[PDB]
Amino acid sequence: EGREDPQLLVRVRGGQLRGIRLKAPGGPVSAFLGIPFAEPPVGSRRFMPPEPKRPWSGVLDATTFQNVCYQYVDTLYPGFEGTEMWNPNRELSEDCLYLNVWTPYPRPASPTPVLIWIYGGGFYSGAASLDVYDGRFLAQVEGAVLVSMNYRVGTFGFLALPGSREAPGNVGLLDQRLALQWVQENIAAFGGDPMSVTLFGESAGAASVGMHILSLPSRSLFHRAVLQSGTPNGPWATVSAGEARRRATLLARLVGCNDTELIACLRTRPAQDLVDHEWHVLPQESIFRFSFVPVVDGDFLSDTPEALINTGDFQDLQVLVGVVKDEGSYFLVYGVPGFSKDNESLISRAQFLAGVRIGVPQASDLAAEAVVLHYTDWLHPEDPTHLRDAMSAVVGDHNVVCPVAQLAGRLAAQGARVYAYIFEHRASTLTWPLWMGVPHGYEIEFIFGLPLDPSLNYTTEERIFAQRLMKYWTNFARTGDPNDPRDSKSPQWPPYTTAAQQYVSLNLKPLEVRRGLRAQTCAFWNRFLPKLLSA
Ligand SMILES: *[C@@H]1O[C@H](CO)[C@@H](O)[C@H](O)[C@H]1NC(C)=O
Numbered sequence: 001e002g003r004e005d006p007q008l009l010v011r012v013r014g015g016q017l018r019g020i021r022l023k024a025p026g027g028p029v030s031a032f033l034g035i036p037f038a039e040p041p042v043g044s045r046r047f048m049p050p051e052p053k054r055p056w057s058g059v060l061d062a063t064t065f066q067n068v069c070y071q072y073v074d075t076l077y078p079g080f081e082g083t084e085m086w087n088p089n090r091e092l093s094e095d096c097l098y099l100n101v102w103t104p105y106p107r108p109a110s111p112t113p114v115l116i117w118i119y120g121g122g123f124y125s126g127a128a129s130l131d132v133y134d135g136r137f138l139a140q141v142e143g144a145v146l147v148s149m150n151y152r153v154g155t156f157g158f159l160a161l162p163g164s165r166e167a168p169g170n171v172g173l174l175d176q177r178l179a180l181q182w183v184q185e186n187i188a189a190f191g192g193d194p195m196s197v198t199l200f201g202e203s204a205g206a207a208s209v210g211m212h213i214l215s216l217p218s219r220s221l222f223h224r225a226v227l228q229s230g231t232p233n234g235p236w237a238t239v240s241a242g243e244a245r246r247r248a249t250l251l252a253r254l255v256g257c258n259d260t261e262l263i264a265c266l267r268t269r270p271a272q273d274l275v276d277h278e279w280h281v282l283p284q285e286s287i288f289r290f291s292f293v294p295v296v297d298g299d300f301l302s303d304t305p306e307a308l309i310n311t312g313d314f315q316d317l318q319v320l321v322g323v324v325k326d327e328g329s330y331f332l333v334y335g336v337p338g339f340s341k342d343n344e345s346l347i348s349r350a351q352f353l354a355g356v357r358i359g360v361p362q363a364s365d366l367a368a369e370a371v372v373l374h375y376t377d378w379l380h381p382e383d384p385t386h387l388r389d390a391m392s393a394v395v396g397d398h399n400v401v402c403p404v405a406q407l408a409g410r411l412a413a414q415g416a417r418v419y420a421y422i423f424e425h426r427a428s429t430l431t432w433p434l435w436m437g438v439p440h441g442y443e444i445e446f447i448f449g450l451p452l453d454p455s456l457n458y459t460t461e462e463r464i465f466a467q468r469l470m471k472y473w474t475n476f477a478r479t480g481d482p483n484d485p486r487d488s489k490s491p492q493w494p495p496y497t498t499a500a501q502q503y504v505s506l507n508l509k510p511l512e513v514r515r516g517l518r519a520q521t522c523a524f525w526n527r528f529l530p531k532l533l534s535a
Contacts, residue, residue, distance in 0.1 A: 001059070007106050012186040014055040020063040021105060024140035025452050028105040031136070032190070033129075034066030037182040038097035038175065041152060046267050047159060047167040049174045050097060052181075065129035066098035067091050069152050070271040072124055072278055076334060077341060082431040086121065086441070090129055094156060094271055099149040099179050100128055102135030103190045108143060111193035113477050116183060116222070117148040118176060120203025120230065120441070122290040124154040124278065137449030141467070142474040145192035149179035151208075155274045158292035159248050159266075162241035164259035167266075169244060169295040173215075176208055180221035198224040198477035200320075202444055206230025207237040207294070210407065213317065214308045215300050224480055226320040226473065227407070228447075229327060229440055232305040234403030235362060236288055244295040247281040251291075254280055286361035287331045288399045309407060314416035318480035320473075321408050321496075322421030322503070323517075326437030328359075328396030336391065341433055346384035352391055359395045367532045374524055388435065397518060400440070402525040405517040413498050419482055420496040420503035420517060428459050443506070447473055461508050469506065 001009060007030060008019045019032035038050040045051070068088040077083045104112075117133055119126040127133075128148035135146035151157065152172045160169025184194045199209045199222050209225050210232030212218035231237065239247070249262065254277040257265035266274070281291050296304050332339040336358050338351035347355070356371050357363070363371065375390040377383070404420075412418045423443040432439055445451070451458035451466040458466075472493075476482040482493050491511040494502040501519065505512045 016059045017062045018059045024136045029136045029139045030103045030105045032062040032101040034098045037099050037179050040095035042094045050178050067093035067096045068127040069096035070094050096150045102139040102146040107191040112145050113196040114145045114192040116199050118201030118205040118208045120205040123204045123293045132444050151175035160244040160295045161259045166263040169297050170300040197222045200226035202228040203230045207232045224318045231403040231407045238294050250281045284361040287335050309410045314414045317416040320419045323401050324423045324438045327400040327440050328392040329436035330439045347387050352387040355391045402522040405522040406526045408496050418496040424507040
């Protein structure tokens with residue numbers, strides 16, 4: 001050093017970092033990318049909990065994103081922006097436990113509230129380095145310290161022989177926790193305030209946040225929580241220990257493999273082989289189900305998320321939760337016959353009944369027929385447009401909207417402060433067909449302020465809207481209240497309560513307050529359907 005920018009040199013517990021001055025629309029930001037927070041979980045460490053990164057010597061270069069965690073790469077529509085935007089954008093490697101930090105430039109004078117992002121991707125994919133997770137805008141415009149971490153996905157992250165020592169399960173969650181521990185120790189070096197840490201994440205990221213809420217050792221590592229379109233409760237986010245043992249041993253079989261001896265064999269297999277058989281272990285033909293997810297181990301998760309949210313004390317928790325308008329539409333093109341991005345996907349009644357079996361893969365015959373009876377419009381039981389949209393609603397309600405409703409309700413009744421939204425604006429830049437409405441994942445680019453980047457072709461109202469959303473998120477991070485303390489001209493966002501069940505709509509128009517999160521339909525999923533199983 002000597003000739004470098006004095007603002008880009010920071011020391012953390014493991015050593016010295018050189019970061020990069022990045023250009024945002026309104027000015028420069030400080031970025032520190034690819035900071036290792038753990039020892040590479042490679043070789044004999046595959047399936048194992050992470051061990052903290054051992055200090056390095058010299059100045060670590062922290063100017064580029066690091067490796068993406070080894071993962072299945074989507075090929076449903078080869079070349080299409082709508083799918084490619086979620087695909088890995090750095091080399092795939094099992095050496096992938098690195099995190100990223102964005103701060104104002106120069107770094108702030110007084111300690112600033114910290115936002116930690118946890119990406120989604122079904123627990124089998126994702127990366128903190130995607131364009132949609134770019135922290136530069138929240139750093140520059142709102143003055144936030146933003147952190148995001150890579151965590152292990154798929155088998156490397158979640159394959160479990162529950163009870164064993166060599167594959168205890170949930171290690172992807174432990175990667176996340178270690179990075180939360182890293183923020184507590186080191187964030188003040190960047191001007192971040194470890195006493196004001198908000199977790200936010202979407203889909204499996206949202207479930208991840210919820211699990212930290214429900215896991216006591218994580219509780220002291222953060223203060224507030226945002227869950228976007230996902231929940232630790234519901235049919236996809238967790239598996240029983242039994243079911244995890246079943247899938248782990250079947251995958252072992254498929255690649256040619258006493259728990260110790262089985263795992264030791266699995267550790268000799270190349271990463272890609274594990275990826276190649278990942279999808280072959282699911283009990284039924286299904287959508288919105290993923291092979292290796294968090295396990296109810298009686299350790300990280302002391303009981304089922306359902307049980308923990310029902311009985312927990314959520315005294316001093318502030319939580320922001322919400323959904324997009326059309327949660328289910330996306331998932332339909334990944335294995336319900338009849339559905340495609342390339343046509344209107346108008347379907348027949350038969351195709352609808354088939355889709356319900358695939359979308360509610362755990363339903364008995366009676367339960368499926370109940371789902372079908374509930375979602376059929378009996379004035380027009382054969383109308384293809386309605387059946388198409390009913391199929392989407394079924395998948396969206398079952399996997400996201402009613403899990404969220406359950407979560408908001410239980411948390412509110414047990415002392416938490418809950419704000420609830422539905423996001424209803426479809427990006428003008430969206431490449432998915434119009435029938436998919438406002439699909440799952442497509443609020444993220446707005447929360448992160450991409451529309452602020454003039455080169456991205458968003459409309460002027462979209463720019464203003466993104467700024468509104470950024471204000472909401474960062475106000476909530478600061479105070480546990482999304483509303484502006486000054487701005488009483490703009491309409492208020494009431495807390496969600498069990499008596500009033502209030503939530504807001506997020507679109508180009510000013511906030512509108514609505515009541516009941518799909519209240520009738522969710523009573524079906526959350527109250528009736530379980531009992532059509534206790535029989
Ligand atoms: C749309 O595309 C899929 C796959 O090519 C096809 O099976 C489906 O029937 C199509 N819808 C119609 C009737 O155009």
